Design a protein around this ligand. Structure first.
Ligand SMILES: CCCCCCCCCCCCCCCC(=O)OC[C@H](COP(=O)(O)O)OC(=O)CCCCCCCCCCCCCCC
Ligand SMILES: CCCCCCCCCCCCCCCC(=O)OC[C@H](COP(=O)(O)O)OC(=O)CCCCCCCCCCCCCCC
Ligand SMILES: O=C1CN(c2cn[nH]c(=O)c2Cl)CCN1C1CCCCC1
Ligand SMILES: [Ca+2]
Lengths: 491, 238, 86
């Protein structure tokens, strides 16, 4: 009925609940309330869209409260009692689940993880030792699965070593991919038989699919599809499956060793090759994600990846201009489709012709002129009409001006203005991403690269409650009593 | 070697040609060393130092770009390597008047994907002698996607990075320039070289008294000026 | 064993040492201590990589102290006595 009063009342209540003093006074577990309240406010930020700023700021301050409360720790045992409360590191997993980026990148929390990850130099030593462990990966991976006893099989369970092993396996797969397109390892026979390299590639493809299926049962089509790298893995595995199922059809149906030139389009072998190449592109592109673990290339990559939802909107506005000018330019030239005794027609030939005769060619011509690859004599007809040839050239020129002098520089201005609002919370984001990368290697789930892949609580509540009491007391004394006497003076 | 053979009918890796190649590449560096002369000027010095400080930030970006180059080369060579015609062609490759075999080998593929940052690879190189209008479309789409990723996404992010870095540099810029000019000068204060290349082939305890007196005065002045006379200019609180 | 206490103790000690008053009170040669302390903190900035900002700021303030101490000179002879010492 009265929407105005309802909105004020809801915001006033939520602003009362998200108060550090009220949480520190009457609350059974400050961390749970901070996490849950931050999530609720973040959700409400999108429903009550008239008051986005209020809810976003309240959620931000609920996020900063948990970090400030974790800084009041003065021992490692005292910190492990908090990050392990509930298997191992359950609280940290909950924090990652709730997207508490400030809590995770805390300096003392970020040191316990490093100690759990390295487990035992300068640049040259770290370069030359990581090669020796990655060259001899297959025998470690082979002796782990037979005798997992304390001789050599417990050396592939250390997270750093496991990461090196998986990296070495992936690099071997990439080398085989680069090697598949060589003129020494087959000729062109209709519906061929897999070469010596396809049979080696097949087990990596199977292992990758098995790791993906394992990781996708656990998540359950929620927050698994959010991660964009997992989306790319899904797409490239789909393409590999489609490649397997076309190399067989062209085996049982077609055969005869016909010459390659005199084949016919949509022959299954050609489409198999096309899908295989497009899959190679994605497979090789996945090598960027390796460098979120480096300290120099990590932050830069995260910053690059955050400026992509701002370029897609701009490209969507550009496609409308492209379509408008294509619609205009095809209406003028479609009466002149000569194609008179031409071996090749289109713009992808040495003498370009029929650049605006159909809608598809028109879109292609207007796209390849962003890079200057469409000559200027394509705006001529075989007749002598020096008025349509002028209207067409003016349409082409106006498109060039709008596309290469107006829209491109606005894209540059947008990107410059966005990059400054990103490069402040940049290290928090990078450490949160690196922490997720590390946590994926702390468990004995995969522990094995794809090629070789086919009371107990009530007592602890006492210590945890004692720790919370001390933490809350320290926070109250330090933040809301000792930093209130440093404000300014007024009238 | 000797005998005065005509130049055209020599054979590759003949030592004279490699000597000439190394000599030219050395001339490039020798002439390039003339930039360092202008750290002594007052106008071109700071600008040169600022340019030289924005180079460790471009190398990281180029390293990220090489991965994209290699990925798309791996993709584009897999598609076109069955069509290495080279049928009665005097010259083959992309450095000829009629470009051909642009994606037939990995090396040519890297070269083709590099020279298209500057627009020097024509568009008819994505055709085969057959009539397969489906591989010729997948190849053109791969080439177009590489162009979009390389010339509309990565270049403008390089520009944004450089703009954001240059502001954090141009504050401590004169300090850096004067430190560099001071090193340049100090290299000429001693009688070690003193001669250009063409024509080139107690004593202390007494002084500790004065030094200690000077330090005592300096420390006294600093204490009086900084930690006693600039503490009475802070603000008021509750 | 207890890495958290070890880190706090080391940072607290180094932050005490890089103090203009403590240097100007008990130190045989302020310039040597400023130079050496700045170098040590700059080095530690890369080992204890979890606390880079602290050590970088401490080294920066040790660098600014020596400059501020050299501004309290009022003669050329007095300046040459400092820049020529060995
Ligand atoms: C240095 C920056 C470069 C920018 C260049 C801009 C030049 C502007 C025009 C200069 C005049 C020369 C023309 C003379 C030649 C001739 O007569 O001929 C016309 C030629 C076309 O070639 P022809 O000579 O064959 O006709 O050039 C033109 O067509 C001029 C088109 C100019 C269009 C300007 C559009 C302004 C943008 C408005 C913003 C749009 C908002 C976005 C909408 C979604
Ligand atoms: C003014 C700014 C200019 C920017 C231009 C962007 C245009 C986008 C597409 C417009 C649609 C026209 C296509 C129609 C022609 C056709 O069908 O044909 C397809 C043609 C290829 O030429 P062909 O016509 O011969 O096929 O063009 C294309 O291939 C379109 C490729 C678009 C790829 C977009 C990729 C988005 C970038 C994502 C970020 C990547 C992150 C980095 C990873 C490390
Ligand atoms: O986690 C994955 C998933 N991978 C898949 C999955 N499905 N289809 C594919 O083509 C590929 Cl490459 C392999 C790459 N990595 C990392 C392994 C350690 C080094 C950095 C990359
Ligand atoms: Ca995955």
């Amino acid at each position: 009925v009265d929407s105005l009063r309802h909105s004020r009342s809801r915001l006033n209540i939520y602003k009362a609940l998200a108060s550090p003093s009220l949480i520190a006074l009457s609350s059974e577990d400050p961390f749970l309330t901070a996490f849950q309240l931050s999530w609720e406010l973040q959700e409400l930020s999108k429903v009550e869209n008239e008051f986005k700023a209020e809810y976003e700021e309240l959620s931000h301050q609920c996020k900063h409260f948990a970090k400030d409360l974790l800084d009041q720790t003065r021992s490692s045992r005292e910190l492990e009692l908090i990050l392990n409360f509930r298997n191992e590191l359950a609280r940290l997993k909950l924090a990652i689940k709730y997207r508490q980026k400030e809590f995770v990148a805390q300096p003392n929390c970020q040191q316990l993880l490093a100690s759990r990850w390295y487990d035992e130099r300068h640049w040259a030593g770290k370069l030359i030792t990581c090669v020796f462990i990655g060259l001899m990966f297959p025998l470690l991976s082979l002796c782990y699965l037979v005798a997992p006893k304390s001789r050599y099989g417990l050396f592939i369970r250390k997270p750093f070593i496991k990461f090196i092993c998986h990296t070495a396996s992936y690099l071997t797969f990439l080398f085989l991919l680069l090697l598949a397109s060589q003129h020494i390892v087959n000729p062109d026979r209709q519906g061929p038989k897999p070469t010596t390299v396809e049979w080696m590639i097949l087990p990596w493809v199977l292992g990758f699919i098995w790791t993906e299926i394992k990781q996708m049962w656990d998540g359950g089509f929620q927050d698994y599809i959010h991660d964009w790298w997992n989306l790319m893995d899904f797409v490239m595995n789909s393409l590999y499956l489609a490649t397997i199922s076309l190399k067989i059809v062209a085996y049982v149906k077609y055969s005869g060793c016909k010459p390659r030139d005199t084949w016919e389009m949509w022959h299954p072998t050609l489409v198999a090759e096309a899908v295989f190449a497009i899959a190679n592109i994605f497979s090789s592109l996945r090598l960027i994600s390796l460098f979120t673990a480096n300290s120099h290339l990590g932050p830069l990559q995260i910053s690059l990846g955050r400026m992509l939802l701002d370029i897609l909107k701009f490209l969507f506005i550009y496609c409308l201009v492209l379509l408008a000018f294509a619609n205009g330019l095809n209406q003028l030239y479609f009466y002149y489709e000569n194609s008179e005794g031409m071996t090749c027609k289109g713009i992808r030939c040495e003498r370009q012709n029929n650049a605006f005769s159909t809608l598809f060619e028109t879109l292609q011509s207007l796209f390849w002129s962003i890079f200057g690859l469409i000559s200027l004599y394509v705006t001529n007809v075989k007749a002598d009409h020096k008025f349509t040839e002028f209207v067409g050239a003016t349409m082409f020129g106006t498109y060039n001006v709008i596309s290469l002098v107006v829209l491109l520089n606005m894209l540059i201005a947008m990107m410059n203005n966005s990059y400054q609002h990103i490069a402040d919370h940049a290290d928090i984001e990078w450490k949160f991403a690196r922490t997720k990368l590390w946590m994926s290697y702390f468990e004995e789930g995969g522990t094995l690269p794809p090629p070789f892949n086919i009371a107990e609580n009530v007592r602890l509540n006492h210590q945890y409650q004692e720790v919370l009491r001390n933490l809350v007391k320290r926070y109250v004394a330090a933040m809301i009593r000792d930093a209130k006497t440093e404000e300014g003076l007024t009238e």
